[PDB]
Write a protein that binds this ligand. Structure first.
Ligand SMILES: *[C@@H]1O[C@H](CO)[C@@H](O[C@@H]2O[C@H](CO)[C@@H](O)[C@H](O)[C@H]2NC(C)=O)[C@H](O)[C@H]1NC(C)=O
Ligand SMILES: *[C@@H]1O[C@H](CO)[C@@H](O[C@@H]2O[C@H](CO)[C@@H](O)[C@H](O)[C@H]2NC(C)=O)[C@H](O)[C@H]1NC(C)=O
Ligand SMILES: *[C@@H]1O[C@H](CO)[C@@H](O[C@@H]2O[C@H](CO)[C@@H](O)[C@H](O)[C@H]2NC(C)=O)[C@H](O)[C@H]1NC(C)=O
Ligand SMILES: *[C@@H]1O[C@H](CO)[C@@H](O[C@@H]2O[C@H](CO)[C@@H](O)[C@H](O)[C@H]2NC(C)=O)[C@H](O)[C@H]1NC(C)=O
Ligand SMILES: *[C@@H]1O[C@H](CO)[C@@H](O[C@@H]2O[C@H](CO)[C@@H](O)[C@H](O)[C@H]2NC(C)=O)[C@H](O)[C@H]1NC(C)=O
Ligand SMILES: *[C@@H]1O[C@H](CO)[C@@H](O)[C@H](O)[C@H]1NC(C)=O
Ligand SMILES: *[C@@H]1O[C@H](CO)[C@@H](O)[C@H](O)[C@H]1NC(C)=O
Lengths: 50, 170, 50, 49, 99
């Protein structure tokens, strides 16, 4: 799963079978990393108009 | 009826939902338009059986009871002179209902002037209503009261000319 | 049902009778009119291509 | 339902935005609806298509 | 345009993405039947109301403003003269008080 963003700690209660989270736009919203099995939140990097 | 075509069309997402939603918005907007234009009174007014309005003749614009549609002669002429997944939705108000609105508006303005548009309908004799309207344009009442027969004749001739002009112009 | 257009009223018209209000009601009614929408800007390049 | 007009304007704007967001999840006949997947799966000649 | 009835004044109120207008209107109430005439015949002169309308409570004729029943004695101050009584259809006979 390729993408760009800021990876932070998450407080979302992922069930054990659940791997990743998805938003309305079908982009990944959270991920469970291998080798640690901990739940990471994915937030897009800052952007806006100039 | 093609299943493969619908399967391919599923790739495009919710385009059909957008189109149907826009058409539904237009369809409800048409009924709303008709309500705003015609449903301006909550009271269905009726003219008295005797048509004594001080010489003023409203026969060409009042409903004709003889016709099945209960339409005025001018309204009858107007309705005569205007002639794959696609459906036409009928309007919420029928033509009879819109004609009944117009009849109520005509009866209210003939029997009560402008009073029914601002509150309860207050009856007033029609030559006196037209005298009020003459005051509204800066003309005294006596000008009308002394010329009431002439004004009534001019109004009747003008209405007849309206009917003739509508009938004879394509 | 066939909807009713309104309450039936027969105004008592005659050629020498008038109705004059002996009182009045001070009425206050609301009219709601939209003025503006939400100002949304869409970065076309970022929407299409990220 | 007194304030129905303003709520209708807000609902239409939010619904249009949500429809625009949801349109990103459609692949329009492509192999995937995710650009990252296509870029990490295919060479430029076919990823371009 | 500014509510139902005879418009007096309106008050604006701010709303989210809109405006709400409080339309204060005058609504006539408690109407009463009267017998009316276009003009009053007096001394062979036709009298017409300057601002109001001739009304009769059954036996006596008054002149009142058109939107509120305020009967007044028909005088030469609230009426004007135009012609004789032979032209107006429906003119009725009554005296016109001279102050
Ligand atoms: C009002 O106008 C109508 C039509 O303009 C008059 O009806 C006509 O009446 C005459 C005789 O009374 C007939 O010869 C015509 O054929 C009628 N025309 C139509 C179209 O019906 C009516 O008489 C007028 N007056 C009143 C009081 O209704
Ligand atoms: C003025 O008088 C007329 C008739 O004298 C009244 O009209 C009648 O009202 C009653 C009560 O609703 C009805 O049953 C009759 O059918 C009406 N007659 C007609 C010819 O319309 C009218 O209500 C009176 N107005 C006021 C304000 O008292
Ligand atoms: C005109 O209408 C008003 C109501 O809008 C009447 O005022 C009411 O009068 C009664 C008895 O006099 C009181 O019990 C009410 O409390 C009054 N209402 C208000 C809102 O003040 C008034 O009496 C009417 N006047 C005439 C001449 O009919
Ligand atoms: C019409 O109004 C007039 C004046 O308001 C009434 O005349 C008065 O009636 C009262 C009640 O009986 C008497 O006490 C007065 O002496 C009368 N004044 C005059 C100058 O006559 C009249 O009665 C009213 N008519 C009706 C049918 O209500
Ligand atoms: C109003 O008054 C006039 C004059 O006072 C009345 O006219 C008179 O009518 C009688 C009979 O109808 C005649 O004999 C007189 O010659 C008329 N006089 C004039 C000067 O025209 C008129 O009839 C009255 N109207 C009503 C409705 O009472
Ligand atoms: C290796 O990954 C597995 C999950 O497949 C995990 O249970 C294990 O703890 C990982 N080991 C190390 C040393 O990270
Ligand atoms: C009103 O009609 C009656 C007949 O019902 C008539 O006698 C009277 O003169 C008419 N009045 C006016 C002002 O037309």
């Amino acid at each position: 799963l390729t993408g760009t963003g800021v990876l932070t700690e998450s407080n979302k209660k992922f069930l054990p079978f659940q791997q990743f989270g998805r938003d309305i736009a079908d982009t990944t919203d959270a991920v469970r990393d291998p080798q640690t099995l901990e739940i990471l939140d994915i937030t897009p990097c800052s952007f806006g108009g100039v | 009826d093609s299943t493969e075509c619908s399967n391919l069309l599923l790739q495009y997402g919710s385009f059909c939902t957008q189109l149907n939603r826009a058409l539904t918005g237009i369809a409800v907007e048409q009924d709303k338009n008709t309500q705003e234009v015609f449903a301006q009174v909550k009271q269905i007014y009726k003219t008295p059986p005797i048509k004594d309005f001080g010489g003023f003749n409203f026969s060409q614009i009042l409903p004709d009871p003889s016709k099945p549609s209960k339409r005025s002669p001018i309204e009858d002429l107007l309705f005569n002179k205007v002639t794959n997944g696609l459906t036409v939705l009928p309007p919420l108000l029928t033509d009879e209902m819109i004609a009944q609105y117009t009849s109520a508006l005509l009866a209210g303005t003939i029997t009560s002037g402008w009073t029914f548009g601002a509150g309860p309908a207050l009856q007033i004799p029609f030559p006196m209503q037209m005298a009020y309207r003459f005051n509204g344009i800066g003309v005294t009442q006596n000008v009308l009261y002394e010329n009431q027969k002439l004004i009534a004749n001019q109004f009747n001739s003008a209405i007849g000319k309206i009917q003739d002009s509508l009938s004879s112009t394509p | 049902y066939t909807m009713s257009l309104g309450a039936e009223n027969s105004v008592a018209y005659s050629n020498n009778s008038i109705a004059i209000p002996t009182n009045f009601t001070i009425s206050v009614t609301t009219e709601i009119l939209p003025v503006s929408m939400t100002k949304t800007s869409v970065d076309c390049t970022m929407y299409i291509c990220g | 339902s007194a304030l129905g007009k303003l709520q209708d304007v807000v609902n239409q704007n939010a619904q249009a935005l949500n429809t625009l967001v949801k349109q990103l999840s459609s692949n329009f006949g492509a192999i995937s609806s995710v650009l990252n997947d296509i870029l990490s799966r295919l060479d430029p000649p076919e990823a371009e298509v | 345009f500014c509510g139902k009835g005879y418009h007096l004044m309106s008050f604006p109120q701010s709303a989210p993405h809109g405006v709400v207008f409080l339309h204060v209107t005058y609504v006539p109430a408690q109407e009463k039947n009267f017998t009316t005439a276009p003009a009053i015949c007096h001394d062979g002169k036709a009298h017409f109301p300057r601002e109001g309308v001739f009304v009769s409570n059954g036996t006596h004729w008054f002149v009142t403003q058109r939107n509120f029943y305020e009967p007044q004695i028909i005088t030469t101050d609230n009426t004007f003269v135009s012609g004789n009584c032979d032209v107006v259809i429906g003119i009725v006979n009554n005296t016109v008080y001279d102050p």
